[PDB]
Write a protein that binds this DNA or RNA. Structure first.
Length: 99
RNA sequence: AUUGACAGAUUGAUAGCUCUUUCUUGAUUCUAUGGGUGGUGGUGCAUGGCCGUUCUUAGUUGGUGGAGUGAUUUGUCUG
């Protein structure tokens, strides 16, 4: 392809595990939210639990830091529920803060 | 998936071992099959290495030659 359609997810989650700042699980993502820690978060397009889907959005609504979407609840983490405490991020960064 | 543990229970025990309960741990481990791993388990009558004893004594081999069909002997001897 001509450039790369959303490899800003897969490039960063490989290379961030040099420094080790990826966080996994409902407890630990919630603890990463309830903290001075989490910088970007994710959820499934469709997971289950209206509250569960809502809670992720709701927790973010307090202290900021958005979600996006991605695809398939099995194939979220396999590029590495996600938390993350240039080059790859240039596609994401302009989408997150600005429009 | 596994872990740390207060105050009671229970226990000699301020070992959360296991609990009546309910907070936490974050892929190190658990679950089973194969296979490893470890032991002051057994065998010194499977062995190594070391020590004692035969032996505190003076003794012990093979080379060539001689004797004997041979085991062996002579050398290693009467004094």
């Amino acid at each position: 392809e001509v450039k790369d359609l959303m490899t800003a997810i897969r490039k960063v989650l490989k290379n961030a595990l040099i420094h080790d700042g990826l966080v996994r699980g409902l407890h630990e993502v919630a603890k990463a939210l309830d903290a001075k820690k989490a910088q970007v978060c994710f959820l499934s397009e469709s997971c289950s639990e209206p509250a569960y889907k809502k809670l992720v959005q709701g927790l973010c609504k307090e202290h900021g830091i958005p979600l996006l979407d991605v695809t398939d609840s099995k194939e979220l983490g396999e590029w590495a529920c996600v938390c993350v405490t240039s080059e790859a991020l240039t596609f994401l960064q302009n989408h997150i803060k600005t429009l």
